[PDB]
């Protein structure tokens, strides 16, 4: 019945200080053999331990980042906190709060993990996407939408307002050197549909409160 819930600021600019909070129930950070700490994961990458704090206030830190990390507990409200100073784009990641425990042989394994909070570090401004058609050429046809130059993640893409789902691939976004994301969403359809069926990609970019509905037709 252990629960950990991370909260953070979502988006930051380079050189700002990231402050994260983890609220926990279902155990006391005061009982022995118990700790609480932070582990991050950049999108599509692996895991990096950052720091944890034990029930007796012993603090451990990743040495490559000790000069920027600070961890602290407040038992009085069942919470721990992480500061990461002067962030840069490399600190973009999902940040998980995780309970570390001590066993009789060994210890430093994490037996409960929170759902994570996502942090993007960027000097980019919030910006809805431009949506360009990927027009079916002239069996099976493919068409799609290039969803370009937006910030931040995520966008969602549906087709014909949710009616078209089979054959849809909405690809992971890539980060362009401009600092803006770009992604494509494609769908394969019967060629015999191209003159009669209407195809519209519905792009939702909640960070900018933007919806784009773009009809894709042969050229």
């Amino acid at each position: 019945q252990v629960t950990l819930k991370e909260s953070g600021p979502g988006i930051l600019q380079p050189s700002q200080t990231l402050s994260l909070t983890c609220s926990f129930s279902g155990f006391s950070l005061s009982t022995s053999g118990m700790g609480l700490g932070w582990i991050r994961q950049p999108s599509g990458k692996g895991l990096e331990w950052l720091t944890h704090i034990w029930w007796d206030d012993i603090k451990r830190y990743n040495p490559d980042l000790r000069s920027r990390l600070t961890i602290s507990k407040d038992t009085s409200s069942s919470q721990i906190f992480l500061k990461i100073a002067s962030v840069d784009t490399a600190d973009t990641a999902t940040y998980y709060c995780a309970r570390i425990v001590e066993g009789s042989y060994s210890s430093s394994y994490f037996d409960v993990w929170g759902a994570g909070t996502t942090v993007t570090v960027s000097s980019a401004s919030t910006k809805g996407p431009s949506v360009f058609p990927l027009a079916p050429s002239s069996g099976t046809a493919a068409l799609g939408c290039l969803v370009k130059d937006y910030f931040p993640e995520p966008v969602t893409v549906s087709w014909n307002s949710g009616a078209l789902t089979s054959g849809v691939h909405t690809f992971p976004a890539v980060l362009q050197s401009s600092g803006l994301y770009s992604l494509s969403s494609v769908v394969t359809v019967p060629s015999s549909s191209l003159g009669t069926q209407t195809y519209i990609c519905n792009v939702n970019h909640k960070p900018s409160n933007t919806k784009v509905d773009k009809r894709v037709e042969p050229k």
Binding site: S106, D111, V112, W113
Partner: peptide
């Protein structure tokens, strides 16, 4: 999120 299966 990750889930612990095995330790030690």
């Amino acid at each position: 999120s990750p889930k612990l299966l095995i330790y030690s």
